[PDB]
């Protein structure tokens, strides 16, 4: 029953330590002028974040290579079986189904 | 590019062959889950600001359509805990099957869709492929066939063949006019379905042919009704006797084959001593005919040939298997008391 | 063609080390006779509990006392 | 339902820890096999471990005299043997390997036992049939009756398809 | 029926077969013989008799296929019947023998004008 | 051996969870002593709620959740 | 740490949703999930299924969501907001929250009320186990690795993914 | 017992006004990609509390598409707001 | 239309995961396993349209093995035979 005793112990030191740092001098009596001088060294910066694509694909591109290496995960439990040939013949398919899915897209990464 | 377009366009039917071949509820998920995955790029090809505001109104309307099903698969995994494919053992399953499956076919409601997609897909080439998705689902309903609440599958039917009928009388674009009156013929085949479920397929094949041979004809340039006026005095008149030898046969008149489904279907729906149902269907497909008349008063009346329009060239499209179909879309009535005993 | 195979190895000698290992792991499992030992060991590990069958007449083999002569030789491994 | 009384209960359970219970545990079963394999067959062969309690007191019994045996001859090497294996985690058998002889010095020798290395708990054995081999399987209510078949000698169609008119 | 996904089983040996000169087989490919004549006319052939190599190979196709298909149709109406009598024969309790009697017995309505 | 210890532990366990039930009340709109919730008759391994009653204090919590979350 | 530590997770889970099932300015949408996903992977880690729980962290909650969050800088909303501050979002909330609460109140606040909510007893986890057992990797989903019997189940999923990229190499 | 009525009230997450609407489509698409876990967990119990031992892979296959496919339909939502910059379900243009 | 190819030729596509009792690789059972081989034995030579009005007995308890739907109610109704009377005598049990 002692796991949650070992988790909420950990946060409660951390969720404590924000206030004893952030908050404690935050109410101190120093000046702290409201002037809009903050947001350093790009003073104003008025724009939307524009869509920039080769930022985007490197999200998608991963998400799919991700899946099957969940599918690929239960090899070391499956190395203990009865008929094993249906493993080696089958196990090696996923991989090559992964590696193929590279080679195609590999004609165009662009600047990744 | 050109190879894969035959890899994609092959994987579709492989998406629907695992549907008809399977014993196992999971596979009929995966089965038509990978259409909504593998259909989408076909819409695209010319990358326009409709297809992309089309297939996204399609997508999330076949996304839930599926994703409810998986909720009505896992209900009767609780009760009886035996998958396979048979009556659903529990009423919250079926009522969550059939009226959430009517989304892919769309029936009486669940169509604000079929006109929003079929219209304005920039690709009219086909769009004949939206005759697959009529053929994936039915290949469930034939199996589950002895479980339905039976007060529903008629209540989506009879509110359909009506609502798809009136839908078009107001229409001009002739991609819509086929979009409409393709809800209609989903009124006959799932109205039958609890009584003797073959003599449905009969209406299913006679439908796949007739709507098929329309499009292949609508492919030369043809788009808007008033571009089918500039047709006979320009392209070829042997085309016009065709478009009048079908559009009439498709609502149907007894010397043609379009009369073949009704003529047989009512042999079935009476003999079960329901004679107050079929008239209202029988009589409502009537004002389903007044699209086609008044479509057919466009092309034989020599209406203001377009302008000085001189097409001296010959044709090089693919008419493939059009030189057959309106000898089988018309003349087959004289032939067959097979269709009830052939596919059975 | 060997001039090619030496003129990709002056430029990208990287993936070539992957192909060189890509095959050579596919080929060999159909060769060395050490394999198929691998399938015998892995079948004989008693995960479950052996249940004694009923003996009326035959009873081909395998007497009541296990250490008596009973059945196959698995001790080709113990010496291995 | 019928359950036996509170009686033929409160019997003598072998009360020992789980470290000693795996100490010998090995010479134990390979040499006994008088009730126990047979006692399985009073379960697997016929289920409902209620109808079969009897050998349960036989198989529980074999242990009693076993640990009662060993206490007479040598408990000294045993007591020291299951101490190491009881020095703990996982209860490995590969730490106490040295002392394995000291326990087994005269046990296999004096009172005449043997080390049943890999042949124990394998080589699916047999027992014997003493109790009636039960018919009337577990639940087993009724058949019920199937469909009479159809083959005969056939025909072509009688008058030809009898649809509406459509002679042939 | 049985031997599933067979165009026709081995049991169709005992049927006539449907040999030629039946009006349909002639008619089959007639509707193709009026098909061929179309095949020219769409493109502005403008022959109305064009190459006999297109103006034939249709008629060859239909009647072959029309034939090769009629061989099973007639079959199917036989296996339909076959499975009926053999059921009608047994369960005679579901199949009475009606008696014989009419005149001097039955009254009708009797409503003249 | 190990099993022939358990089967006795549950049959002992049902009786006390019956004999100490049937002596709670015998009610006229009550239940017969030790009926069956099924029609069929054979020995079907009982549900946790059978062995431990509404007792539901601690030694239960160390039974059902005993193995999970830790040694 | 009572016997109710399961029932206390789900009713946080059920409340995990209604945060983002209304309309929260979807940079807080995530924070309606990773709580729900978290507590979700929480519930599953009871019952004995473990491997299958600890994956949702790896394959979905950890891996997937980040893409859902790596965008919504590309679709980036104009000037985000703390949800429930508004009058548009706040109105829809509570009536959901109470609807299970008022359900959860007299669902059983008494002996039974009434029938349809009365056939679910509580508190011992009556079903939550059976008897004892032996061990295989555990017993249950301990053996989730079948490259034996399952094959035609993989080779569709194995092949259906390979096309996932081709579709997306285009429209991109 | 009770854990089957939660989570179920959770699987009415559909709620459809909040399934297509209102704008910030990303909120709609969101409650979709989390419509799972109501399908998953619910089917990670009934499989588990009784030992099926076999369908146990099915939970895995309920994600592997639910991520694969729902990650597709994200793509379009770039094409919409690429040409715009605001998703805003309020684009109707193709009409009927 | 359901072709059933895996009947004609030899392959097994699925047919194994299908029901609650088939193999379970190490031969480990389910809880309600023993009622399958009971209930399938009932309707096999049947054509299933009379099954519903024929067997129905071996099915119902099987549905009541699965969910424990009733035994949980007759159980919850011991909490009303005791634990309204706690003060009125027969604490029940004596501990231990
Ligand atoms: C007329 C439109 C409606 C057709 C209804 C069916 C009429 C044909 C039925 C003939 C008798 C029969 O039972 O068929 C089996 C008969 C059985 O053969 P039979 O021994 O009875 O020979 C009689 C054939 N007739 C009556 C034509 C002399 O086989 C046939 O179908 C005959 C082949 C010709 C059938 C069609 C002939 C074309 C005439 C109509 C042309 C225009 C129609 C519209 C097309 C557009
Ligand atoms: C039957 C099973 C389901 C078939 C329904 C329709 C299948 C059509 C598949 C290809 C259609 C297509 O895209 O062609 C467009 C293409 C044109 O596309 P395009 O003009 O936009 O550009 C062509 C681009 N390249 C060069 C790459 C091809 O071809 C044609 O112009 C001809 C149309 C096809 C004719 C229809 C084929 C069958 C027609 C009768 C069907 C009979 C069925 C039997 C009934 C029993
Ligand atoms: C197809 C034959 C495979 C079996 C061959 C039997 C092995 C025996 C020894 C083979 C010797 C080498 C054979 C040809 C080598 C290819 C030479 C070449 O230029 O092709 C690379 C060509 C040349 O491409 P390139 O001209 O654009 O140069 C770029 C190369 N890199 C990537 C280093 C920058 O590139 C490719 O298309 C390779 C992409 C496919 C990647 C597949 C990775 C391997 C996955 C495991 C399989
Ligand atoms: C690996 C096989 C690939 C199968 C894919 C074939 C594509 C199917 C596309 C269907 C188009 C719509 C037409 C449906 C009518 C089917 C006709 C038919 O069932 O006859 C099959 C025929 C005969 O069918 P049958 O009478 O023996 O049994 C099936 C009949 N149904 C399907 C109606 C129950 O099969 C053959 O052997 C002909 C060769
Ligand atoms: C002799 C054939 C007719 C006389 C010459 C044909 C002239 C011609 O090319 O016109 C085809 C004409 C199509 O009609 P339309 O397009 O309205 O007229 C303008 C076309 N110049 O008419 C057509 O040919 C259209 C084709 C219709 C089907 C073929 C019928 C044509 C008649 C000749 C063959 C008849 C064979 C039928 C035999 C008995 C079957 C009933
Ligand atoms: C039969 C059995 C099989 C037989 C196989 C035979 C042998 C095959 C095995 C070889 C594989 C070794 C590892 C893989 C190859 C090394 C990785 C590689 O390919 O680097 C290629 C890199 C590309 O550079 P280039 O193509 O020239 O383009 C730039 C031009 N301006 O060119 C480079 O040089 C990049 C260098 C690395 C980049 C990072 C280096 C940063 C410093 C880190 C070094 C520390 C690592 C040392 C290892 C510590 C180990 C404890
Ligand atoms: C009624 C009885 C039922 C059975 C029907 C059997 C099918 C009849 C077979 C003949 C079909 C004719 C045809 O295939 O298309 C006609 C034409 C090809 O004719 P051809 O002689 O090759 O002229 C070539 C000149 N370039 O082709 C063209 O017009 C354009 C060239 C395309 C060739 C396509 C060849 C397809 C052959 C098999 C077609 C099967 C699908 C038929 C569609 C309807 C089926 C109901």
Rounded to 5, what percent of chain C is helix, strand, coil? 25, 0, 75
| Residue matched to tokens 């030189």 | B323
How many Å apart are CA E100 and CA E89, to the nearest integer?
A: 21
Please answer whether residues G121 and H5 qualify as being in contact, where contact means their C-beta atoms are separated by less than 8 angstroms.
no
Mutation for I interface: H4, H50, H59, most I CBs within 10 A: H50
The residue extents of the domains of chain G are 4-169
Q: Is D33 at the interface with chain C, CB within 8 A?
A: yes
Other C-beta atoms closer than 10 Å to the C-beta of B40 total: 24
Mutation for E interface: B20, B198, B331, B342, most E CBs within 10 A: B331
| Residue matched to tokens 């399609």 | B58
- Resolution (in Å) of the shown entry? 4.6
DSSP string, D101-164: HHHHTTTTTTS-----TTTTT-S-------S----S-SS-------PPP--S---S-SSS--SS
> How many angstroms separate the alpha carbon of residue B319 from the centre of ligand 2?
8
How many Å apart are CA A60 and CA G165, to the nearest integer?
A: 9
Give the minimum alpha-carbon distance from D142 to chain E in angstroms, rounded to a whole number: 26
DSSP annotation of G136? B
B60 contact residues in H (CB cutoff 8 A): 20, 28-29, 32, 73
- The separation between CA D137 and the C-alpha centre of its own chain, rounded to angstroms, equals 20
Other C-beta atoms closer than 10 Å to the C-beta of B106 total: 22
> How many angstroms separate the alpha carbon of residue B8 from the centre of ligand 3?
26
How many Å apart are CA H42 and CA H47, to the nearest integer?
A: 9
Please answer whether residues B67 and H38 qualify as being in contact, where contact means their C-beta atoms are separated by less than 8 angstroms.
no
| I-chain residue closest to G139, CA distance | I28
Tokens of B11: 């994987």
Other C-beta atoms closer than 10 Å to the C-beta of D101 total: 11
DSSP string, B3-41: THHHHHHHHHHHHHHHHHS-S-HHHHHHHHHHHHHHSHH
The residue extents of the domains of chain H are 2-84
Please answer whether residues G36 and G16 qualify as being in contact, where contact means their C-beta atoms are separated by less than 8 angstroms.
yes
Please answer whether residues B133 and B35 qualify as being in contact, where contact means their C-beta atoms are separated by less than 8 angstroms.
yes
Please answer whether residues B123 and B150 qualify as being in contact, where contact means their C-beta atoms are separated by less than 8 angstroms.
no
> How many angstroms separate the alpha carbon of residue E4 from the centre of ligand 4?
10
> How many angstroms separate the alpha carbon of residue C2 from the centre of ligand 4?
54
Q: Crossing angle for the helix pair B51-73 and B25-38, nearest 10 degrees?
A: 170
Q: Is B44 at the interface with chain G, CB within 8 A?
A: yes
DSSP string, H49-90: HTT-SSGGGHHHHHHHHHHHHHHHHHTHHHHHHHSSS---TT
Other C-beta atoms closer than 10 Å to the C-beta of G112 total: 17
> What residues flank ligand 1, with Cβ below 6 Å?
B 255, 334; D 167; E 23-24, 27
| Radius of gyration of the CA atoms of chain G, in A | 21
What are the helix (H) ranges across chain F? Answer: 2-22, 48-51, 61-64
Q: Which atom of ligand 4 is nearest to the CA of B135?
A: 12
Query: How many Cα atoms within 13 Å fall on the side-chain side of residue D8?
Result: 15
Interface contact B341-E41, CB threshold 8 A: no
Q: Is D89 at the interface with chain F, CB within 8 A?
A: no
I25 contact residues in H (CB cutoff 8 A): 53
How many Å apart are CA B58 and CA E99, to the nearest integer?
A: 67
Query: How many Cα atoms within 13 Å fall on the side-chain side of residue H95?
Result: 2
Indicate the burial class of B13 (C-beta count within 10 angstroms; 0-12, 13-18, 19 or more). Answer: middle
Mutation for H interface: A70, A72, A94, most H CBs within 10 A: A70
Q: What is the 3-state secondary structure (H, E, C) of G17-76?
A: HCCCCCCCCCCCHHHHHHHHHHHHHHHHCCCCCCHHHHHHHHHHHHHHHHHHHHCCCCCC
Interface contact D125-C62, CB threshold 8 A: yes
Q: Which atom of ligand 7 is nearest to the CA of E54?
A: 21
Q: What distances in angstroms separate CA B189 from CA B184, B203, B205, E62, one per listed residue?
A: 10, 6, 11, 30
Ligand 6 contacts CB of residue C21 (under 6 A): yes
Kindly provide the b/e burial profile for residues G30-64, where b requires at least 16 CB atoms within 10 angstroms of the residue's own CB. bebbbbbbbbbbbbbbbbbbbbbbebbeebbbebb
Please answer whether residues B31 and B137 qualify as being in contact, where contact means their C-beta atoms are separated by less than 8 angstroms.
no
In this complex, which chains have at least 3 CB pairs below 8 Å with chain E?
B, D, I
Give the minimum alpha-carbon distance from G161 to chain B in angstroms, rounded to a whole number: 10
DSSP annotation of A103? H
DSSP annotation of A19? I
Domain covering A7-107, topology: Methane Monooxygenase Hydroxylase; Chain G, domain 1 (1.20.58)
Domain G4-169 matching CATH 1.20.1600.10: the answer reads no
How many Å apart are CA D3 and CA F1, to the nearest integer?
A: 22
| D-chain residue closest to C56, CA distance | D128
How many Å apart are CA I92 and CA F19, to the nearest integer?
A: 11
Kindly provide the b/e burial profile for residues G4-25, where b requires at least 16 CB atoms within 10 angstroms of the residue's own CB. eebbebbbbbbbbbbbbbbbbb
Q: Is F38 at the interface with chain A, CB within 8 A?
A: no
Chains C and B touch (3+ CB pairs under 8 A): no
Other C-beta atoms closer than 10 Å to the C-beta of D63 total: 21
Minimal-distance CA residue to ligand 6 atom 22: C14
Please answer whether residues B299 and B222 qualify as being in contact, where contact means their C-beta atoms are separated by less than 8 angstroms.
no
Please answer whether residues H27 and G24 qualify as being in contact, where contact means their C-beta atoms are separated by less than 8 angstroms.
yes
The residue extents of the domains of chain A are 7-107
Give the minimum alpha-carbon distance from H94 to chain B in angstroms, rounded to a whole number: 7
Give the minimum alpha-carbon distance from E90 to chain D in angstroms, rounded to a whole number: 10
Ligand nearest to the Cα of B200, by number: 4
Minimal-distance CA residue to ligand 7 atom 28: B320
Of the candidates H11, H76, H83, the beta carbon closest to that of B49 is on H83
Question: Which architecture does CATH list for H2-84?
Answer: Orthogonal Bundle (1.10)
In this complex, which chains have at least 3 CB pairs below 8 Å with chain H?
A, B, G, I
Give the minimum alpha-carbon distance from C62 to chain D in angstroms, rounded to a whole number: 7
What are the helix (H) ranges across chain A? Answer: 8-17, 53-71, 85-105
The experimental method behind these coordinates is cryo-EM
Tokens of H39: 């399908």
Of the candidates D6, D14, D50, the beta carbon closest to that of F19 is on D6
């Amino acid at each position: 029953m002692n796991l949650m005793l070992a988790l909420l112990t950990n946060f409660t030191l951390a969720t404590l330590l924000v206030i004893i740092a952030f908050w404690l001098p935050q109410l101190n009596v120093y000046s702290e002028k409201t002037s809009p001088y903050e947001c350093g060294f790009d003073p104003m910066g008025s724009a939307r974040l524009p869509f920039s694509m080769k930022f985007f694909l490197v999200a998608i591109t991963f998400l799919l290579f991700d899946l099957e290496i969940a599918l690929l995960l239960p090899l070391p439990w499956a190395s203990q079986t009865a008929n094993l040939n249906t493993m080696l013949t089958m196990a090696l398919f996923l991989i090559i189904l992964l590696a193929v899915s590279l080679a195609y897209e590999w004609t165009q990464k662009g600047l990744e | 590019n050109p190879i894969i377009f035959i890899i994609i366009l092959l994987t579709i039917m492989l998406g629907t062959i695992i549907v008809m071949i399977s014993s196992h509820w999971l596979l009929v998920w995966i089965g038509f889950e990978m259409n909504m995955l593998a259909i989408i790029p076909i819409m695209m090809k010319n990358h326009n600001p409709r297809a992309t505001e089309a297939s996204t109104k399609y997508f999330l309307t076949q996304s839930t359509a599926s994703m409810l099903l998986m909720m009505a698969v896992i209900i009767n995994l609780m009760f009886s805990g035996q998958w396979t494919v048979m009556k659903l053992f529990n009423p919250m399953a079926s009522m969550l099957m059939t009226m959430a499956l009517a989304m892919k076919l769309g029936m009486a409601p669940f169509h604000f869709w079929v006109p929003e997609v079929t219209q304005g897909i920039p690709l009219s080439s086909g769009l004949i492929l939206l005759t697959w998705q009529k053929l994936a689902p039915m290949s469930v309903l034939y199996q589950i066939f002895p479980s339905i609440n039976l007060n529903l599958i008629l209540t989506l039917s009879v509110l359909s063949i009506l609502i798809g009928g009136w839908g078009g009388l107001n229409q001009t674009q002739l991609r819509k006019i086929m979009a409409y009156s393709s809800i209609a013929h989903m009124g006959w085949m799932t109205a039958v379905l609890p009584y003797n479920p073959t003599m449905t397929l009969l209406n299913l094949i006679i439908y796949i042919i007739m709507t098929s041979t329309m499009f292949t004809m609508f492919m030369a340039n043809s788009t808007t009704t008033t571009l089918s006026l500039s047709h006979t005095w320009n392209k070829t008149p042997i085309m016009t006797v065709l478009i009048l030898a079908t559009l009439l046969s498709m609502g149907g008149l007894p010397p043609l084959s379009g009369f073949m489904p009704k003529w047989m279907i009512i042999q079935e729906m009476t003999k079960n001593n329901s004679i107050i149902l079929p008239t209202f269907m029988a009589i409502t497909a009537l004002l389903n005919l007044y699209f086609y008349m008044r479509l057919t008063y466009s092309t034989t009346l020599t209406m203001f040939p377009s302008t000085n329009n001189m097409k001296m060239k010959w044709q090089f499209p693919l008419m493939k298997k059009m030189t057959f179909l309106p000898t089988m879309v018309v003349l087959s009535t004289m032939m067959l008391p097979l269709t009830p005993m052939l596919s059975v | 063609v060997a001039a090619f195979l030496k003129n990709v190895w002056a430029k990208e000698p990287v993936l070539v080390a992957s192909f060189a290992i890509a095959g050579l792991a596919v080929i060999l499992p159909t060769l060395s006779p050490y394999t198929k030992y691998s399938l015998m060991i892995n079948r004989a590990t008693p995960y479950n509990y052996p249940v004694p069958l009923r003996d009326d007449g035959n009873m081909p083999d395998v007497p009541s006392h296990p250490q008596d002569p009973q059945g196959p030789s698995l001790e080709w491994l113990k010496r291995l | 339902v019928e359950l036996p009384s509170l009686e033929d209960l409160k019997v003598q359970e072998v009360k020992v820890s789980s470290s000693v219970l795996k100490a010998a545990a090995h010479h134990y079963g390979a040499q006994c096999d008088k009730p126990n394999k047979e006692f399985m067959l009073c379960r697997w062969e016929e289920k409902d471990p209620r109808r079969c309690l009897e050998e349960g007191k036989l198989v529980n019994q074999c242990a009693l005299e076993f640990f009662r045996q060993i206490k007479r001859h040598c408990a000294e090497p045993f007591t020291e043997y299951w101490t190491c294996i009881d020095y703990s985690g996982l209860q490995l058998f590969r730490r106490c390997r040295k002392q394995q002889a000291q326990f087994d010095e005269c046990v296999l020798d004096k009172l005449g036992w043997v080390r049943p290395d890999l042949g124990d708990l394998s080589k699916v054995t047999k027992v014997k049939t003493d109790r009636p081999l039960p018919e009337n399987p577990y639940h087993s209510r009724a058949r019920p009756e199937p469909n009479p078949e159809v083959e005969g000698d056939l025909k072509p169609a009688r008058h030809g398809s009898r649809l509406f008119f459509w002679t042939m | 029926g049985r031997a599933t996904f067979q165009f026709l089983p081995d049991e169709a040996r005992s049927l006539p077969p449907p040999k030629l000169t039946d009006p349909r087989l002639a008619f089959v490919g007639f509707l193709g013989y009026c098909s061929g004549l179309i095949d020219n006319a769409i493109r502005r052939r403008p022959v109305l008799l064009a190459g006999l190599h297109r103006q034939l190979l249709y008629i060859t196709s239909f009647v072959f296929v029309g034939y090769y298909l009629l061989k099973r149709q007639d079959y199917m109406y036989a296996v339909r019947d076959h499975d009926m009598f053999s059921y009608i024969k047994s369960h005679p309790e579901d199949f009475p023998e009606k008696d014989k009697k009419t005149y001097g017995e039955v009254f009708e309505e009797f409503h003249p004008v | 051996l190990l099993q022939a210890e358990k089967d006795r532990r549950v049959l002992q366990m049902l009786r006390e969870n019956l004999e100490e039930e049937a002596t709670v009340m015998k009610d006229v709109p009550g239940w017969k002593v030790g009926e069956s919730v099924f029609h069929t008759t054979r020995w079907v391994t009982p549900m946790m709620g059978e062995l431990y009653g509404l007792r539901a204090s601690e030694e239960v919590l160390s039974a059902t959740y005993g193995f999970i979350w830790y040694t | 740490m009572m016997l109710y530590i399961v029932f206390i997770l789900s009713v946080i889970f059920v409340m995990g949703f209604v945060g983002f099932s209304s309309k929260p300015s979807p940079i807080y949408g995530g924070l309606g999930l990773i709580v729900s996903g978290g507590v979700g992977c929480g519930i599953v880690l009871n019952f004995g299924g473990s491997f299958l729980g600890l994956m949702v962290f790896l394959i979905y909650l950890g891996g997937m969501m980040v893409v859902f969050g790596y965008t919504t800088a590309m679709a980036t909303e104009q000037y985000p907001e703390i949800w429930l501050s508004n009058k548009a979002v706040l109105g829809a909330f509570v009536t959901g929250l109470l609807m299970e609460f008022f359900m959860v109140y007299y669902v059983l606040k008494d002996k039974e009320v009434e029938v349809v909510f009365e056939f679910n007893g509580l508190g011992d986890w009556v079903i939550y186990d059976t008897g004892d057992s032996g061990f295989f990797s555990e017993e249950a989903m301990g053996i989730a690795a079948l490259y034996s019997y399952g094959t035609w189940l993989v080779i569709v999923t194995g092949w259906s993914l390979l096309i996932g990229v081709v579709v997306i190499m285009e429209i991109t | 017992s009770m854990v089957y009525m939660n989570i179920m009230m959770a699987f009415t997450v559909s709620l459809v006004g909040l399934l297509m609407y209102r704008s910030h489509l990303m909120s709609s698409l969101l409650c979709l990609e989390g419509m799972m876990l109501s399908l998953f967990v619910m089917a990670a119990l009934t499989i588990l509390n009784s030992h099926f031992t076999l369908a146990s892979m099915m939970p895995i296959i309920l994600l592997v598409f639910a991520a694969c496919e729902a990650a597709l339909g994200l793509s379009l939502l770039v094409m919409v707001s690429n040409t715009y910059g605001t998703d805003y379900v309020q684009n109707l243009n193709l009409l009927q | 239309p359901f072709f059933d190819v895996q009947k004609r030729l030899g392959v097994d596509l699925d047919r194994w995961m299908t029901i609650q009792s088939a193999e379970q690789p190490h031969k480990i059972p389910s809880r309600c396993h023993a009622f399958e081989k009971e209930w399938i034995e009932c309707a096999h030579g049947i054509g299933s349209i009379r099954a519903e009005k024929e067997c129905k007995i071996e099915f119902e308890d099987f549905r009541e093995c699965l969910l424990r739907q009733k035994t949980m109610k007759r159980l919850h109704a011991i909490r009303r035979q005791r634990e309204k009377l706690i003060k009125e005598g027969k604490y029940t049990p004596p501990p231990h």
